[PDB]
Every structure is written in structure tokens, then in C-alpha cells.
């Protein structure tokens, strides 16, 4: 329900600057809450007093607010909710980065994945994948309830 | 066989929380728990002749496993959560909400509300075996019913909602 | 429900002394029997509670040609055990014949505590197999107690002597005791001096003062075997309810021990149930199999993990059993006490019916069979010969214990449906 | 899956002792088998996991007339290897005849660890060719293991003795071993005492204490040959999938070694492959050609460079091969461990099937042929002559190893598509 309307967009305002407007809006809807709300208001209040529309000032002020919101949202994501561990788990199981487990799962569950599909086969391949997870005994805590077979 | 209605006295500053329809739910879980304690103690107080002992362990394990399911797995998990939830009460109304969200889920995990004549009646009719076998102290006609009713219980419960697999092993 | 301990013999009085002292420290009790100054625990089950300050335990001490009972008397704890009930050879027959003459007064000592107490669950015997004065007298007292109390039950905390094999009549003495126990004991918990000694050499450097230090190991087992009755709980607060799953048949009533932190001086329940099934933690020295296994854990135990842990033990299969029973391993939980060290915060014990104790019975039967062929120590003392001229109670005991060995291996067989 | 190692003989027990010590230091293991405070690795294949994290190797130590095995026992690491499986002449026939009488108990020692494992994968033997007690017993055990485990595989880390040629019956002993290995070993990795000694004189000034220092070279090869199995990831996780590329014929299963930093006390992948193909880094002493080449690198290796490196080595043509097979060199990658020195940050090894090892086989065949015409050491000992009166197992071994030599040179020929 939040998107550009290209037909209503004024022609002197380009699409790129409005994309930056969209990004800062979607981010603040979804920061570092250091209250430049009134100072950027004081920037935008000053920009209201100017008679004549200048684009490069309008580009400069939104890209200032564009970078400040994206510099935080990086820092919150990569450090508090570390992405490097998440991308490792994706490669380990979607892209077969775990070789001992996925070879043992093919070895242990060979016949029951060979057999044709039917509504009860789903629980059977999950407990064998769960057995395959403990067949390769390397097992920490949780790591497992974020993945299942469908 | 199913009576013994229990009540208690509540003062007015507590009367709004422990309501009158609350006592009945507590009495319900009390009645079913007493029947489980009955079967468990009735097969315990005593100590093809010794062939009765095979049926004894084959039934005593089942009733003991059901008791170990209900009390430990339900009547102690949600209670341990419930104390840690009532110690952070900050409001008149959400105390009623956190209490009712203990009652209406402990009445669902212990299968007593719905699916009674579909699942719960099987546990009842096999508790009747723990009565009948306890009195006599026909033997071959007991295992033909017992293997059938136990396999009926597993082949009815096999539809598993997901928490019944904690007892589905046996 | 209260229990009265019939500690008898020198070794049995030693282990009963240490067991009651451990429970004095574990409960809120001082050495005088007066309440501890710091003091949830129900002390009524093992200690007679009065408005008298001395909470006197229900301890029956029997002395026969007493030496160590005087050492028991000159203790700071002598005012604790005061039910005023201590009454004045190395052969089984000498101990039996000495017990027969004083049976009425020691039984009146039994009667007085049975009258004073509310309801007596059972009589606990700190029995010493082949213990000189302890054996013989313990067998005779065991034979009297079931006749006088037929509804009631008798447990035996038997310290079965294996010291790498001094008593030259030790297989004869032990042989007669095991017949009396197999017919006249409802339950027996077995312990081995060699196994406790090997555990002593494992955990410490103690070799020469073996008995004095093994007393503490025996007392840890004896305390933790009754903790679930001692401290209030949702289940297993009665002994006959606790020991019911372990004994599936009246003949095989012998129970093995083990303790997960043998060096109990965090750990999850998966790990402690796993450690319990390893043979180093076991304190006991053709296919063979358990008949029924039980475990009790005391400490900072999470309750959501226990079903996954039961499934993990089921997956790992560290305990192999194929009995005639369909019996399963059972999980139980208790509370660790306050005021004592909570070191090894999670700490556990097992009791189990296992067919390997038939080998330990067969060992002293083999020693007896060799000694019986040699007749090197028939003793021929006038007590021994005038008591048994026929010497056929040894043969009756041999056929009864041979029935027991065959019963154990028949329990291993698929056909305990046939008579063992 | 899990792999049980059958170290036998004095020299083989030395190298197995050192191999498990290097895996103790390399993995997170103490001399007592306990994990340490300082320490993601598939430990299970090479180490049994006990309850209290005592990672004990599945080592089977066989002693025959033991001297160095007592020296193995008085070590700080004696608690690390405790599966409790050590059971009590310089001729092959003496070793065989001594192994035959104790085969049942040493095989029960095999059976117990086979029961302990979930799935068994292979038996890797620290075998000593012509090693007195080690030879003979190793060939007999090799013959028993494939019969009892027909689906299973056997690898042999043979230390093939070349000491510039004391054992006067060494060609006879080695000759019999090679027949037993050619029919009854799925894989063999070959090592040479002269080649390791020349490398010792190259990298250091060590000449006289040759064996003690060459133990470390052998152990570096033995550890790095299994690193890709021991560590996680999808780089050849099991043994047999690695094995199949190295061995392309049932008869030719002998594998040569090499190590890029012989002085392992930055370097790119192009450099380490080019250094590896040179003959100084090789540890082994008509056209001749490889049949199949493989390499494994462990360290700070850039990933995008490896295809440029594979093409660059191919254009260099430092390794010349024209086999009947279409086989190519394959570059594999693994991770260097933490906690140990990361000196020579990039460091690698090769395993390959080469026809040059047939010359080293032919050398001891030539020594045997000369000794067999002379009959100077038939030994004529009553063990030797009563064991082989015909002395025809040497002639069967000669015709089998001559088939092996002819098969190697036929693999050099363009028509090993036909019979060798």
C-alpha cells in the first residue's frame, strides 16, 4: 500500500530522488532515534521559505536523511542480529555446504525418498533428517528448529 | 464412580479473579486426576500361574506412563510458566487474562473438552480393564481385548494437536 | 510413614551409624537430636518427633560380644539416637545360636517401637553377609520378623563381601544367609566391597584404609536411595511404591547401585542419564540383560528437557535389556537439600534389576563347592556340629541358591513363561 | 563412517602411537583424553566419544614379544588410549604361527570395538613390511579381516623397508607380505625408509638417529592424508569416495606420497602445486607414467585462483602421465587447524598412483631371487620348515608379485584396456 505513483509525480522532480524518499519512508515505517526531527524540519522549514524550486538542494537534503537511516539499519542488522552467521546456515543447507550430513541423509533415507509421495511421507523424511543430524554427531544447541523438509 | 465435588472459600478481593465457573474447571481436572491415581495405586498396592504378571507389567507400564505424561508434562510445565507469569502482574484485567489462559489451555492439553467420544473414551474404557483385572486376584480373553484396545488407542491417536506425540511412543 | 532400621553386627552398626549421621546433617538436626539452629523436609519418616528437643531416630542397635558399639556410645551423637534399645563368634552357626537365646528381649525392643510409632512401613536391616556375628543372627532375625509381621515387608541393605577372597568359612556363612534371604526377604539391595574398593582406587589414592572410606560411599548410596521418601514429592513418597517396578518377580529381588558424579565433591539431564549407564559409575563388580531400570535425580533439573532426554537415552541405547518383562527405564526427580554443599548441582543414582549379580552369587557358590568337596573348613566346632550334625542346611541352601541362579538365567531366557 | 586402526608390530605400534599423539595435539584433546579449555571438526570418525568427553581413539594395539609396548604404556598419554585391548620372532613364518594361536582373542578385541561403533567403514593397518613380528602376523590378520568383513575395506599404511639393504631373510619376509596384500588389501599407501632418510639428510643433519626422527615425517603424512575426512565440509567426507579416484584397478592399489613444505618449520596455489610435482618433495626412492594424481591443500588459500592454477600446471606439464585411464589431476582443499602453529600458512600433500613403485617392488624381488638361487637363508629353523616344507608359498608369492610387475608395465602400455 506504499508505492510511487508515477503519473502524479511532478516532471521537474526526478524518479531517483523520489525513490530515496520512498526508501527513507519505508525504513522509518518498518532508526538511530537521535532527534534531528526538528532540525530536519528546520532544514525543510528553511527550504519552504525559498521562493524558487531548486532540485540539487532537494536531492541533498533527502540523501542526507537517506544515508543516516541506512547507516543505522545496517548497524542494527549486522551486529545485533548478525547476518554472517545467517548466510552461513543458508549456504550449509540450501546450497549443500554440509557434506557429511547431506550425504548421510541420502544414505539413511534412500528407500523412503525413492518411494512415491503420499501425505505421511513428510514426517518420515523429517525424523530421518533429524536422525541424519545426529548421525553426523556434531550437534550444538538449537540450530535445528529453523529448518524442516516439505 | 465419578463424583466428589470439591469447592473452597474465596474472599471478595480475590472473588473477582477465582470466579464461580473457575472452581468447576479445577474440580474437573481434580476428578480425572483422582481416577488416574486410583488405577495407578490399585495396580501397585498388591505384590499359566505367573502369566498374570506378564499382563501386570504390560498394563502397569501403560497406566504409569499416562500418569507421568499428564502430571509432569502438563500439570508442571504450564504451572512453572504460570508462576513466572503471575509474578509480573501489572494490571487488574491481565491477571484474569493470564489466569484464564492457564485454565483454557490446561483443559485442552489434558484431553477433556472435545474429541471425547473419539479419543478420550478409549482411555476410559481401558481404565475399566485396570478395574476388572484389579478385582480378580477368562485370562486368555483379557489379552485379546488388551492388545486390541491398546492397538486401537495407538491407531486412533496416530492422526497427530502436536503435543500428543510426547505420549505416542507407548 | 515411619521406618525402623534394624542395624546389627559390627559392620552393620558402622554403616547404620554413618547413615543416621548423614541424615542428621542432611535434615535440620544437631548432634544431640535437638533441632538445628538454622532450621520443608519431613523428618517424621526417619526421626521420632516429640516436643522433647531430642528428635530421636528409630534406630535399633544390637551388639554381640561388643567392641565397636562402645565406640558408637562414646560419640557426640549418642544423645541423638536415644530410644534406649541396645542389648548385650565368627561363625554363622555361632551367631544364630547366640541370637536364639536373646530373641525375646530383642523382639520386645522391636515391639516397643512398633507400639510407640503410628504406622510402621517396614524394617530396614543394615545386614552384613558372612559378617561373623552379623550373619547368622541377621538370618535368624529375618526369619522371625516375617512370621511375626506377615503383612509387612523387609528390606536388606546387604553389603555382600567380596575382598578378592580373613574368614575361611566365609562361603559357608554367606551361603546360609542367601537361602534365608531368598525365601524370607521381600527386597535386597546389593553392594560389593571389591567394587567399592575399585571405585576408591579410581576416585582417590585410598587403598589400605578401605573400609573407613567405603563407609562414606555406602552412606551416599543409602541416603540417595531414600531421598524420594524423605523429602515430599508428587510421587514415590512410599518405599513400596518406589521399589515395585524394580522387582518383577519375588525370587529376583536383588538390586544394583550406581551414582553419576562418583566425584560429587552445569550438567544436563541428557548427560547425567547417559553417564549413569556407563560401567565405571556402577558399584557392582551367554546373553545378559537388565530386567528393570529406575533412576532418581536431585538438583537443578530442567523439566521440559526430560522427555527429549528420555528419547535420547532411547536413541543411544547404553543400557541393553531383553527381559521377559516389558519393563522400561523410568525417570524420577527429587529436590537437593539446603544447608549442605550443592556441588555437582545435578546429581543422580540408579537402582536396577540386572542378571549379572547371579555371577557374583555363583562366585561364592563356587568357592563353597570347592570348600565343600575339600571339607577343609567344616569348622567341626562343638557349636557348629551340635547345631548342624547333618550339615544338610548347607545342601538345602545350595539347592535354593542354585534355583536362584537358574531363575536369573531363565529370566534372561525367552521362556520365563516356564517356571524358572 | 567410524574407522578402527589395527596397529601391530614394534615399528607399527611406534608410528600409531605417534599418529594418535599428533591427532591429540591437533584436535581438542589432552594427554588424558579430556577436552581442554582452549578447545568445528568431525571428531567422531577417528575418536570414540565417551560420556565425560573422553575422546578415546579406536586403536587396537597388538603386542608380540613386547618390548616397546611397555614403553608405550609408561607414557602420559596412556589414559588417552584406554579401550583396554592390548594382548600378549624375526621371521615371517614365526609371526604368522604366533598370530594363529591368539587369533580368536585378538579378533574378539576387534569384535568389541565393532559392536561399539554405529557403522564400521574400514580397518587401517599400521603395518610393517618385513618387520619381524609385524610381518607374518599382519598378513595373517589381513587374511582374516576380509573374510569376516567382506563388504568392508582394508587400508595399509605400509612402511616398505629400504635401508640400502639387519635382516637377512628380509626379501623372503617382504615377498610373502606383498602376495597377501595384493590379493587381500583393497588399498595400500607406500613409504620408504631410504627416501625418508634422504629427505632427513636433505632437510636436517640427522643421519644416525634415523628412525626416531623419520617417525615425525611418517606421522605428518599420516595426519594430512586423513585431514579432509576429519574436518567438516563437503570435500570428500568419507574414505571410500576419496579412495575410488586414487585406485583405478583392483590390482594396482599402491599410493605414493609427497609434501610441498618438507621444511614446514605467503605462498600461492600455483607455487605449492609446482613445488609438489618436483621429485625432491616426493618421499619415494621404458616409459613410466602416473595413472591418477590427487592433491589436498590446507591453509590460507584463495578460491578464485585455483582454476587459473589448474590450467597453469596443466600448461607447465611438470607431471607426465599417459595411462590407460583418462584420469586427471584433481585439486582439493581443507582447513588448517587452530591452536597449533600456522607456519607455512599454505601447506599441501599429494597421493597418486605411479608406475615407478613397481621398480621398488622389483628390487626386493631381485634380492629374493638372488637369495633364492643361493638358498643362503632358507632359515631351515624348525618353525620355518614345519610351517612350509614345500617352500612353495614363496613361489606363489613370486608369481603373484611378478603378475603385479607385469600389470604395472602393462598399465604403462597403451593397451591395458586388454588384460594386463
Swiss-Prot record, chain A:
<protein>
    <recommendedName>
        <fullName>Gamma-tubulin complex component 4</fullName>
    </recommendedName>
</protein>
<comment type="function">
    <text>Component of the gamma-tubulin ring complex (gTuRC) which mediates microtubule nucleation. The gTuRC regulates the minus-end nucleation of alpha-beta tubulin heterodimers that grow into microtubule protafilaments, a critical step in centrosome duplication and spindle formation.</text>
</comment>
<comment type="subunit">
    <text>Component of the gamma-tubulin ring complex (gTuRC) consisting of TUBGCP2, TUBGCP3, TUBGCP4, TUBGCP5 and TUBGCP6 and gamma-tubulin TUBG1 or TUBG2. TUBGCP2, TUBGCP3, TUBGCP4, TUBGCP5 and TUBGCP6 assemble in a 5:5:2:1:1 stoichiometry; each is associated with a gamma-tubulin, thereby arranging 14 gamma-tubulins in a helical manner. Gamma-tubulin at the first position is blocked by TUBGCP3 at the last position, allowing 13 protafilaments to grow into a microtubule.</text>
</comment>
<comment type="similarity">
    <text>Belongs to the TUBGCP family.</text>
</comment>
UniProtKB/Swiss-Prot annotation, chain B:
<comment type="similarity">
    <text>Belongs to the TUBGCP family.</text>
</comment>
<comment type="function">
    <text>Component of the gamma-tubulin ring complex (gTuRC) which mediates microtubule nucleation. The gTuRC regulates the minus-end nucleation of alpha-beta tubulin heterodimers that grow into microtubule protafilaments, a critical step in centrosome duplication and spindle formation.</text>
</comment>
<protein>
    <recommendedName>
        <fullName>Gamma-tubulin complex component 5</fullName>
    </recommendedName>
</protein>
<comment type="subunit">
    <text>Component of the gamma-tubulin ring complex (gTuRC) consisting of TUBGCP2, TUBGCP3, TUBGCP4, TUBGCP5 and TUBGCP6 and gamma-tubulin TUBG1 or TUBG2. TUBGCP2, TUBGCP3, TUBGCP4, TUBGCP5 and TUBGCP6 assemble in a 5:5:2:1:1 stoichiometry; each is associated with a gamma-tubulin, thereby arranging 14 gamma-tubulins in a helical manner. Gamma-tubulin at the first position is blocked by TUBGCP3 at the last position, allowing 13 protafilaments to grow into a microtubule.</text>
</comment>
Curated annotation (Swiss-Prot), chains C, D:
<dbReference type="GO" id="GO:0005525">
    <property type="term" value="F:GTP binding"/>
</dbReference>
<dbReference type="GO" id="GO:0005634">
    <property type="term" value="C:nucleus"/>
</dbReference>
<dbReference type="GO" id="GO:0097730">
    <property type="term" value="C:non-motile cilium"/>
</dbReference>
<dbReference type="GO" id="GO:0036064">
    <property type="term" value="C:ciliary basal body"/>
</dbReference>
<dbReference type="GO" id="GO:0000931">
    <property type="term" value="C:gamma-tubulin ring complex"/>
</dbReference>
<dbReference type="GO" id="GO:0042802">
    <property type="term" value="F:identical protein binding"/>
</dbReference>
<dbReference type="GO" id="GO:0005200">
    <property type="term" value="F:structural constituent of cytoskeleton"/>
</dbReference>
<dbReference type="GO" id="GO:0000212">
    <property type="term" value="P:meiotic spindle organization"/>
</dbReference>
<keyword id="KW-0963">Cytoplasm</keyword>
<keyword id="KW-0342">GTP-binding</keyword>
<dbReference type="GO" id="GO:0005814">
    <property type="term" value="C:centriole"/>
</dbReference>
<comment type="subunit">
    <text>Component of the gamma-tubulin ring complex (gTuRC) consisting of TUBGCP2, TUBGCP3, TUBGCP4, TUBGCP5 and TUBGCP6 and gamma-tubulin TUBG1 or TUBG2. TUBGCP2, TUBGCP3, TUBGCP4, TUBGCP5 and TUBGCP6 assemble in a 5:5:2:1:1 stoichiometry; each is associated with a gamma-tubulin, thereby arranging 14 gamma-tubulins in a helical manner. Gamma-tubulin at the first position is blocked by TUBGCP3 at the last position, allowing 13 protafilaments to grow into a microtubule.</text>
</comment>
<dbReference type="GO" id="GO:0007020">
    <property type="term" value="P:microtubule nucleation"/>
</dbReference>
<dbReference type="InterPro" id="IPR036525">
    <property type="entry name" value="Tubulin/FtsZ_GTPase_sf"/>
</dbReference>
<dbReference type="GO" id="GO:0045177">
    <property type="term" value="C:apical part of cell"/>
</dbReference>
Amino acid at each position: 500500500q506504499f508505492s510511487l505513483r508515477v503519473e502524479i509525480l511532478p516532471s521537474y522532480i526526478p524518479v531517483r530522488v523520489a525513490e530515496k524518499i520512498l526508501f527513507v519512508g519505508e525504513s522509518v515505517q518498518m532508526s538511530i532515534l537521535k532527534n534531528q526531527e526538528d532540525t530536519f524540519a528546520a532544514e525543510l522549514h528553511r527550504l519552504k521559505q525559498q521562493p524558487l524550486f531548486s532540485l540539487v538542494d532537494f536531492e541533498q537534503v533527502v540523501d542526507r536523511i537517506r544515508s543516516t537511516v541506512a547507516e543505522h539499519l545496517w548497524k542494527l542488522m549486522v551486529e545485533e542480529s548478525d547476518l554472517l552467521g545467517q548466510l552461513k546456515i543458508i549456504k550449509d543447507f540450501y546450497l549443500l555446504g554440509r557434506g557429511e550430513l547431506f550425504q548421510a541423509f541420502i544414505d539413511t533415507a534412500q528407500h523412503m525418498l525413492k518411494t512415491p509421495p503420499t501425505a505421511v511421507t513428510e514426517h518420515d523424511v523429517n525424523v530421518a533428517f533429524q536422525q541424519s543430524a545426529h548421525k553426523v554427531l556434531l550437534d550444538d544447541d538449537n540450530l535445528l528448529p529453523l529448518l524442516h523438509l516439505t | 464412580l465419578d463424583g466428589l465435588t470439591l469447592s473452597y472459600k474465596v474472599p471478595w478481593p480475590v472473588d473477582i479473579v477465582i470466579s464461580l465457573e473457575c472452581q468447576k474447571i479445577y474440580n474437573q481436572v481434580f476428578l480425572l486426576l483422582l481416577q488416574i491415581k486410583w488405577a495407578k495405586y490399585s495396580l501397585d498396592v498388591l505384590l499359566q500361574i505367573h502369566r498374570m504378571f506378564l499382563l501386570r507389567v504390560k498394563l502397569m507400564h501403560f497406566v504409569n506412563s499416562l500418569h507421568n505424561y499428564i502430571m509432569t508434562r502438563i500439570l508442571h510445565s504450564t504451572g512453572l510458566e504460570f508462576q513466572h507469569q503471575v509474578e509480573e502482574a501489572k494490571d487488574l484485567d491481565q491477571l484474569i487474562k493470564i489466569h484464564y489462559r492457564y485454565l483454557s489451555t490446561i483443559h485442552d492439553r489434558c484431553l477433556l473438552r472435545e474429541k471425547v467420544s473419539f479419543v478420550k473414551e478409549a482411555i476410559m474404557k481401558v481404565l475399566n480393564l485396570a478395574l476388572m483385572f484389579a478385582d480378580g486376584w477368562s485370562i486368555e480373553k483379557m489379552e485379546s481385548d488388551f492388545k486390541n484396545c491398546h492397538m486401537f488407542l495407538v491407531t486412533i491417536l496416530n492422526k497427530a494437536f502436536p503435543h500428543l506425540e510426547s505420549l505416542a511412543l507407548s | 510413614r515411619e521406618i525402623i532400621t534394624l542395624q546389627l553386627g559390627q559392620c552393620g552398626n558402622q554403616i547404620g551409624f554413618e547413615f543416621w549421621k548423614q541424615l542428621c546433617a542432611e535434615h535440620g538436626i544437631s548432634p544431640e537430636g535437638i533441632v538445628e539452629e538454622f532450621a520443608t523436609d519431613r523428618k517424621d519418616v526417619f526421626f521420632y518427633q516429640a516436643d522433647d528437643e531430642h528428635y530421636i531416630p528409630r534406630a535399633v542397635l544390637l551388639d554381640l560380644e561388643p567392641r565397636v558399639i562402645h565406640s558408637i556410645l562414646n560419640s557426640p551423637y549418642a544423645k541423638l539416637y536415644n530410644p534406649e534399645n541396645i542389648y548385650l563368634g565368627n561363625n554363622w552357626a555361632s551367631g544364630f545360636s547366640q541370637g536364639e537365646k536373646i530373641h525375646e528381649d530383642i523382639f520386645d525392643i522391636i515391639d516397643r517401637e512398633a507400639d510407640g510409632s503410628d504406622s510402621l512401613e517396614g524394617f530396614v536391616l543394615c545386614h552384613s553377609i558372612a559378617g561373623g556375628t552379623g550373619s547368622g543372627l541377621g538370618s535368624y532375625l529375618l526369619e522371625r520378623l516375617n512370621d511375626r509381621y506377615p503383612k509387612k515387608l523387609v528390606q536388606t541393605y546387604s553389603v555382600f563381601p567380596n575382598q578378592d577372597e580373613d574368614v575361611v568359612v566365609q562361603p559357608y556363612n554367606s551361603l546360609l544367609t542367601l537361602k534365608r534371604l531368598t525365601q524370607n526377604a521381600d527386597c535386597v539391595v546389593v553392594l560389593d566391597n571389591t567394587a567399592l574398593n575399585r571405585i576408591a582406587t579410581d576416585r582417590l589414592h585410598i587403598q589400605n584404609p578401605s573400609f573407613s572410606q567405603i563407609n562414606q560411599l555406602v552412606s551416599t548410596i543409602m541416603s540417595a536411595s531414600t531421598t524420594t521418601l524423605r523429602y515430599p514429592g508428587y510421587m514415590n513418597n512410599d518405599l513400596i511404591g518406589l521399589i515395585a517396578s524394580l522387582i518383577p518377580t519375588p525370587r529376583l529381588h536383588f538390586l544394583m547401585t550406581g551414582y553419576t558424579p562418583l566425584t560429587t565433591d552445569k550438567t544436563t539431564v541428557l548427560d547425567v542419564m547417559r553417564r549413569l549407564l556407563q560401567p565405571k559409575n556402577v558399584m557392582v563388580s551367554t546373553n545378559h540383560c537388565y530386567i528393570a531400570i529406575l533412576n532418581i535425580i536431585q538438583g537443578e533439573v530442567d523439566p521440559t528437557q526430560v522427555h527429549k532426554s528420555l528419547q535420547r537415552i532411547r536413541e543411544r541405547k547404553l543400557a541393553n535389556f531383553i527381559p521377559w518383562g516389558p519393563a522400561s527405564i523410568q525417570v524420577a526427580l527429587s529436590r537437593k537439600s539446603p544447608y549442605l554443599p550443592s556441588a555437582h548441582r545435578v546429581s543422580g543414582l540408579m537402582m536396577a534389576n540386572h542378571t549379572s549379580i547371579s555371577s557374583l552369587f555363583e562366585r561364592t557358590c563356587r568357592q563353597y563347592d570347592k570348600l565343600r568337596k575339600r571339607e577343609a573348613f567344616l569348622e567341626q566346632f562343638r557349636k557348629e556340629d551340635m547345631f548342624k550334625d547333618n550339615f544338610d542346611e548347607m545342601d538345602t541352601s545350595r539347592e535354593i541358591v542354585q534355583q536362584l541362579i537358574d531363575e536369573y538365567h531363565a529370566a534372561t531366557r525367552p521362556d520365563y513363561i516356564s517356571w524358572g
